[PDB]
C-alpha cells in the first residue's frame, strides 16, 4: 500500500488531466524485428510476364502504352524471358502479343533510373483507399525507396501492401514498412533512429546486413489523427489531434533532418504539409506554426525545405457530394490526379523555389472561395443518404431450392499436350499407377485442393470431418451423418458452411497439440543434482525386493528391518544423490502433425491392431489402401494378372518408429509394461513388413531404404530400377517419418529449423512459418507423414487398363563427395548432366519425346533454411544449362514444403503426388507463405516464382516436371515425371481408346467407392 497510493494519485490525475485511455492510446508498438521489405520486383515481373500470356489478346491493345511502360525497370532476365515469349507468340501467330513482348524486352534493357531516383521518402498513415496510399503508389512508379509506417502489422495489411508494391513497383523501387505509433514519442524516436543508423542483425556465427543507410529526402506526414467516433473523447480529442498533427510531425521533421546534417551538408530535407473553409483555416493555423518556426530558427534554413500545398476536395474518402460541388463550380479530383498535382512540386524547379522561402501553393480548384459551407453540403448529403442507402430490399427469385454436395463424377484434366507417336514400346516404360499420402492435411485430395484454392470442397470437408471424428454415419433413428458431440441431422446443404472453419482449425501447419494422451513433462534436457542425507520413507515390499534394492547400497548405508512392513529400510549417508528429473517445456512448437483427432479405425483398421503396432505402420496401411482403392485397384487383381513374385515392396521408412521408441523407453523407465513384441515392431522395416503381411502380401524384393530426408525418393528410384531390370512389374514404393518430442527438441538445438522464438519476434503468423525462397526464413518446420506411390511398367498398366498418373523418365540419387568442412554445400546432383545432350537425363527425356526446353515445372526441395534455398537454385540452374535449356525459357517453381512442412522421410511422396496432380490439372499452386524473394536468387535466369494460382488450361500445356530432394547428409535425388499422354502416345492407335475408357472407369469406380464408404458402409481394408 505504500507505493500504490502515489501510483493511484498518478493514475487518477492522468485520468482527470488526460483520460482513462491514455496508457493504451499512447502505448509504443515499434519493434525493429517486425519490419518487412518488399523489394522483389523481378520475380513479380516474371509472373506478370506469364500472366500476360495467360490472358487473351482482346485485352492487350486497349492497354498497350501502360503495359509497354510497366516493364521499364527490370533485370536482363526479364528482357530475355520477354524475348522468349515474343518468339513463342511468333510461333503461335500473335502479332499483338509479339509487339507487346518485344517492347517489354526493349524497355527492360533501359538502364537510366526513374525520375523518383535515389530519394528516400517517408509516408505515414498509408491506409487502403487513402491519398497516402496513392502517393506511395506514385513514388513506387517513379522508382523510389518508400518507408511507410502503419498502426498494426497483420495478414490483411501485409497482403494489401504486397499487392500495392507488386502492382505499382518500377525501376529500383523498394517499399520498407514498419508498425509504429504516431501518437507516441518513443516510437517516433525509434523510427528516426532506425531510418538513420544502419541495421545489421548479428546472428551467432555471422551477421546479416539489412539496412545500409538512408537520409530521407522527402516526408509525407499524412497520418490521420484517428477515425473513431464511439468514445465521446472530444474534450481529449481536441488536444490529441492537435498533438498528433502539429507536435508529432514537427518532432518527426526534427529527427529526420538531424541524421543527414553532419553526414552531408547542403542536403536539405523536404516536407509536404497536407492542408485541408474552416478546415482550411485549421490547416493555415497548423501552417503558421511550423513555417513560423522556419522563419524563427536559422538552422532549419539550411536543413529543411519547408513546402506545402492547399489541397482541395477528393471524391474518395459520396457521389452526391461530388455532384453538388460540380454543380457549384469547384472542380474536384480523385486520389491519383491529386497526387500527381501534389508531387509535381518536388522537382528541381520547385525545390529551388522553396529554397529561399517556403512555397504556398494552392491546389484547390474552386473551394478556396467559400461559395458553399461544408455543413451546408453535409446537410444535403445526409438528407440524401438517408433516402438512398437507408432503403434496402431484396428481389429473391421464386425457386429457392437448396444445393447439395455433387455426386462423384470423373476428373476434369486440362487438355492434354500433343506430340507425335513414340517409337518406344510400353515394355520399356515405367509409369506411376497409383499413390496416396497421409500428411498434415490428411489425404492427397484435400491437400491438393488446399494447395490450389485454399478452400476445401464439400467432398474434402466431409472426408476430413469423417476421418477426424467430427462426423459419423448411423442409421438407427434415420440414416445419415450424426455429429459426435450432439447427434443431429446434419443437412448436406450446409455441410461446408457449418464444418469448414472447424476442419481448417483441425488441419494444416499449426501449434503442437498433444494427441498421444501422455503428459508433456516426461522428455526434456534438464539438469538436477541434489545430495540428501535425510530420512528415506518407504512402502510395504518383500524382503527379497529390499535386499535387491540394498544390493549395491550397503557400503554407503545402514540397513534396518521393519517387521510391520516386512521389508528392509535403506538410509544412505552424505554424498548420495537422488534423481528428481525436472522437465521444462519448449512451449509453442508449431509443426506439421496429421489432422487432430485422426482416427485410423474409421478406415477399417481394427482397434486392437491400431493400439498394438506403431502408428507409423497404421499410417502406412492407411496410405497403401488409400492408393490402391483410389486407383481402382486391389492386390488380388495384380495376383490375378501377374505371379506373386513379380510384385515387390520398397517402402522405406525415414528413421523408423520414433514415437514407438520413445514410448518403449518411457514404458521401460516408468514400468509401463512394454509390449513384449514391440521391440520387433520398432525396427524401421517392420512398418512395411506389417503392411505387406496385412494388405498386399507380395513375394517380391523387400528393400526399405533410409536417407533421413529423401527415403521415399530413393525408394522410388530403386523401384524403377527393379522394374527396369525385370525383377518386378508392380512395385509398392514409398516412405514415412514421424515427429517426436526428442525430434523437435534436438532439431531446435541444431538451430537448423524454425524455433518459434525469433519467428514470433518478427511477427510471422504460425501457419506461415515455412517460407522457402523468402527473405526472412530461418529454418524448416518439421512435420510428420508420408505415404506410398505405386510403380508399374506399361505392359501391366495397358494389359490391366490401369490409370497412369505420370511416366517416370529418370530416377537417381547422388552424393556430395569429399568435404571435411561440414558447412560446405553439396552439388553432386549434377551427375545427371555429364555430356549435355548425351547425358542420361537428356537421353531419357528425348527417348520419351521431351526436349530440354520442354521441362516446365520444377518441384524444388526448398527446405526453407538460409543455406539450401540458394544453392538448390544454383544446382537447378547448372542442370538447366547442362541440358542445353534455351536462354530465357521460364521454369515454374512449385515449393510444396511451404504448405505441408518438412516431413523428413516422407517429403518425396508429397512432391511426387503434387507434381502428378499438377500435370493432370495444369494449375501451378502458389507459395502464399512468400512475401519477398531474396536478392541472391536474382542470378537465376529461368526461374519463375508463383504467388497466385496460375490456371494453365488450353493455353500452356505442361509436358514434364522434375523432382529434387537434397537429403540430409550429402545424399540427393532426381526424379523426372512426364505427362501421362506419353504413355498413350507410346501405344498403337488401335488401343488408346479402349485403354483410356478402362482407365477412366477405374478412376471413377475408385472415387465413388471412396464416397460410398464415406456415406453408406462397406469399410475400407476388408481383411478376411
Amino acid at each position: 500500500a505504500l507505493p500504490a497510493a502515489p501510483d493511484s494519485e498518478l493514475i487518477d490525475l492522468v485520468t482527470a488531466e488526460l483520460g482513462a485511455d491514455w496508457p493504451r492510446l499512447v502505448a509504443p508498438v515499434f519493434d525493429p524485428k517486425k519490419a518487412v521489405v518488399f523489394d522483389d520486383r523481378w520475380a513479380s515481373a516474371r509472373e506478370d510476364l506469364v500472366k500476360l500470356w495467360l490472358t487473351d489478346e482482346g485485352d492487350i491493345d486497349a492497354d498497350w502504352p501502360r503495359l509497354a511502360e510497366r516493364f521499364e525497370g527490370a533485370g536482363h532476365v526479364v528482357a530475355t524471358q520477354a524475348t522468349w515469349w515474343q518468339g513463342k507468340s511468333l510461333a503461335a501467330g500473335r502479332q499483338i502479343h509479339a509487339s507487346l513482348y518485344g517492347r517489354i524486352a526493349a524497355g527492360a534493357e533501359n538502364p537510366e533510373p526513374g525520375r523518383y531516383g535515389g530519394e528516400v521518402a517517408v509516408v505515414t498513415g498509408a491506409s487502403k483507399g487513402s491519398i497516402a496510399a496513392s502517393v506511395v503508389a506514385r513514388l513506387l512508379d517513379g522508382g523510389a525507396t518508400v518507408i511507410a509506417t502503419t498502426s498494426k502489422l497483420d495478414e490483411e495489411r501485409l497482403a494489401f501492401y504486397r499487392t500495392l508494391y507488386r502492382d505499382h513497383a518500377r525501376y529500383g523501387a523498394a517499399l520498407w514498412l514498419v508498425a509504429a505509433n504516431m501518437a507516441s514519442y518513443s516510437d517516433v524516436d525509434a523510427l528516426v533512429e532506425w531510418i538513420g543508423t544502419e541495421q545489421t542483425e548479428s546472428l551467432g556465427p555471422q551477421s546479416i546486413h539489412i539496412k545500409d543507410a538512408q537520409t530521407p529526402t522527402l516526408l509525407f506526414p499524412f497520418a490521420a489523427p484517428r477515425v473513431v467516433g464511439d468514445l465521446s473523447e472530444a474534450g481529449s480529442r481536441a488536444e490529441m489531434e492537435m498533438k498528433v498533427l502539429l507536435w508529432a510531425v514537427q518532432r518527426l521533421i526534427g529527427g529526420l533532418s538531424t541524421i543527414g546534417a553532419e553526414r552531408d551538408i547542403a542536403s536539405r530535407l523536404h516536407v509536404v504539409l497536407p492542408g485541408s473553409d474552416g478546415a482550411y483555416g485549421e490547416a493555415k493555423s497548423a501552417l503558421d506554426a511550423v513555417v513560423s518556426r522556419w522563419h524563427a530558427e536559422s538552422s532549419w534554413a539550411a536543413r529543411v525545405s519547408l513546402a506545402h500545398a492547399l489541397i482541395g476536395w477528393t471524391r474518395g474518402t459520396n457521389d452526391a457530394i461530388v455532384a453538388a460541388v460540380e454543380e457549384a463550380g469547384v472542380t474536384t479530383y480523385s486520389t491519383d490526379e491529386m497526387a500527381a498535382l501534389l508531387l509535381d512540386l518536388c522537382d528541381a524547379e520547385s525545390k529551388v523555389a522553396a529554397a529561399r522561402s517556403p512555397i504556398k501553393a494552392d491546389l484547390t480548384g474552386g473551394l478556396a472561395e467559400a461559395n458553399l459551407d461544408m455543413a451546408e453540403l453535409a446537410a444535403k448529403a445526409r438528407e440524401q443518404m438517408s433516402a438512398a442507402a437507408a432503403v434496402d430490399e431484396d428481389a429473391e427469385a421464386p425457386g429457392a431450392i437448396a444445393a447439395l454436395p455433387s455426386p462423384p463424377r470423373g476428373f476434369t484434366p486440362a487438355p492434354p499436350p500433343q506430340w507425335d507417336d513414340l517409337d518406344v514400346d510400353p515394355a520399356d516404360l515405367v509409369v506411376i499407377v497409383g499413390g496416396a499420402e497421409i500428411g498434415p492435411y490428411g489425404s492427397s485430395r484435400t491437400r491438393f485442393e488446399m494447395e490450389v484454392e485454399n478452400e476445401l470442397s464439400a467432398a474434402g470437408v466431409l472426408e476430413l470431418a469423417w476421418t477426424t471424428g467430427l462426423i459419423r454415419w448411423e442409421d438407427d433413428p434415420q440414416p445419415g451423418w450424426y455429429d459426435t458431440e450432439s447427434g443431429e441431422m446434419v443437412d448436406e446443404s450446409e455441410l461446408v458452411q457449418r464444418y469448414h472453419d472447424a476442419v481448417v482449425q483441425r488441419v494444416g501447419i499449426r501449434e503442437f497439440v498433444d494427441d498421444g494422451a501422455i503428459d508433456p513433462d516426461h522428455a526434456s534436457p534438464l539438469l538436477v543434482s541434489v545430495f540428501l542425507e535425510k530420512d528415506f520413507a518407504f512402502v510395504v515390499s518383500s524382503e527379497a525386493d529390499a535386499r535387491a534394492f540394498v544390493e549395491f547400497d550397503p557400503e554407503h548405508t545402514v540397513i534396518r528391518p521393519v517387521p510391520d512392513s516386512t521389508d528392509w529400510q535403506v538410509i544412505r549417508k552424505a554424498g548420495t544423490e537422488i534423481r528428481v528429473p525436472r522437465k521444462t517445456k519448449l512451449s509453442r512448437v508449431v509443426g506439421g502433425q496429421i489432422p487432430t483427432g485422426f482416427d485410423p479405425t474409421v478406415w477399417g483398421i481394427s482397434a486392437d491392431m491400431a493400439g498394438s503396432i506403431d502408428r507409423l505402420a497404421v499410417w502406412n496401411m492407411v496410405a497403401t489402401v488409400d492408393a490402391f482403392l483410389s486407383s481402382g485397384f486391389s492386390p488380388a487383381e495384380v495376383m490375378r494378372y501377374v505371379h506373386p513374385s513379380l510384385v515387390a515392396n520398397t517402402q522405406g521408412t525415414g528413421m523408423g518408429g520414433g514415437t514407438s521408441m520413445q514410448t518403449m523407453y518411457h514404458g521401460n523407465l516408468l514400468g509401463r509394461n512394454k509390449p513384449n513384441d514391440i521391440f520387433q515392431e520398432v525396427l524401421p522395416n517392420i512398418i512395411a513388413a506389417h503392411v505387406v503381411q496385412s494388405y498386399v502380401g507380395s513375394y517380391g524384393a523387400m528393400i526399405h531404404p533410409v536417407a533421413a530426408c529423401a527415403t521415399a525418393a530413393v525408394s522410388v528410384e530403386e523401384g524403377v530400377d527393379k522394374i527396369r531390370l525385370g525383377k518386378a512389374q508392380l512395385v509398392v514404393a514409398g516412405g514415412l517419418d514421424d515427429l517426436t518430442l526428442e525430434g523437435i527438441i534436438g532439431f531446435g538445438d541444431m538451430a537448423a529449423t524454425a524455433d518459434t522464438s525469433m519467428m514470433c519476434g518478427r511477427g510471422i503468423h504460425d501457419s506461415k512459418f515455412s517460407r522457402p525462397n523468402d527473405r526472412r526464413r530461418l529454418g524448416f518446420v518439421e512435420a510428420q507423414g508420408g505415404g506410398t506411390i505405386l510403380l508399374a511398367r506399361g505392359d501391366l498398366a495397358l494389359r490391366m487398363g490401369l490409370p497412369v498418373l505420370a511416366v517416370v523418365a529418370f530416377a537417381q540419387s547422388f552424393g556430395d563427395g569429399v568435404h571435411t568442412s561440414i558447412p560446405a554445400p553439396g552439388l553432386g546432383a549434377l551427375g545427371a548432366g555429364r555430356g549435355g545432350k548425351d547425358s542420361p537425363l537428356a537421353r531419357a527425356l528425348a527417348k520419351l519425346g521431351v526436349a530440354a526446353d520442354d521441362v516446365a515445372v520444377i518441384s524444388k526441395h526448398d527446405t526453407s533454411t538460409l543455406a539450401n534455398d540458394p544453392n538448390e537454385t544454383e544446382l537447378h540452374e547448372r542442370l538447366a544449362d547442362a541440358l542445353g535449356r534455351s536462354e530465357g525459357a521460364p521454369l515454374f517453381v512449385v515449393s510444396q514444403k511451404s504448405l505441408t512442412g518438412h516431413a523428413k522421410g516422407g517429403a518425396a511422396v508429397f512432391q511426387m503426388m503434387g507434381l502428378c496432380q499438377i500435370l493432370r490439372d495444369g494449375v501451378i499452386p502458389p507459395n502464399r507463405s512468400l512475401d519477398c524473394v531474396d536478392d541472391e536468387l536474382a542470378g537465376s535466369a529461368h526461374f519463375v516464382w508463383v504467388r497466385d494460382t496460375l490456371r494453365l488450361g488450353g493455353k500452356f500445356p505442361l509436358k514434364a516436371g522434375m523432382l529434387t530432394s537434397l537429403g540430409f547428409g550429402h545424399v540427393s535425388g532426381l526424379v523426372a515425371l512426364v505427362h501421362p499422354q506419353a504413355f498413350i502416345a507410346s501405344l498403337d492407335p488401335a488401343q488408346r481408346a479402349d485403354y483410356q475408357r478402362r482407365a477412366d472407369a477405374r478412376l471413377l469406380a475408385g472415387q465413388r467407392r471412396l464416397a460410398s464408404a464415406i456415406a453408406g458402409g462397406a469399410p475400407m481394408y476388408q481383411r478376411p
Binding site: 530420512d535 545402514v558 540397513i559 534396518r560 528391518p561 529400510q569
Partner: protein
C-alpha cells in the same frame, strides 16, 4: 463421538518427537539382522 482423530494425532506427534530425538543422540537402532 468418533474420537480416533486425537489418538492418531498424538501417536503421530510422539512418533515424530522420538524420531527427532533419535538422530542427534547418536542412538543407532536396527543394527541386528535376522541370521537364524
Amino acid at each position: 463421538a468418533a474420537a480416533l482423530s486425537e489418538f492418531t494425532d498424538q501417536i503421530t506427534g510422539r512418533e515424530g518427537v522420538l524420531a527427532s530425538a533419535a538422530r542427534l543422540v547418536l542412538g543407532q537402532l536396527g543394527l541386528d539382522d535376522p541370521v537364524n
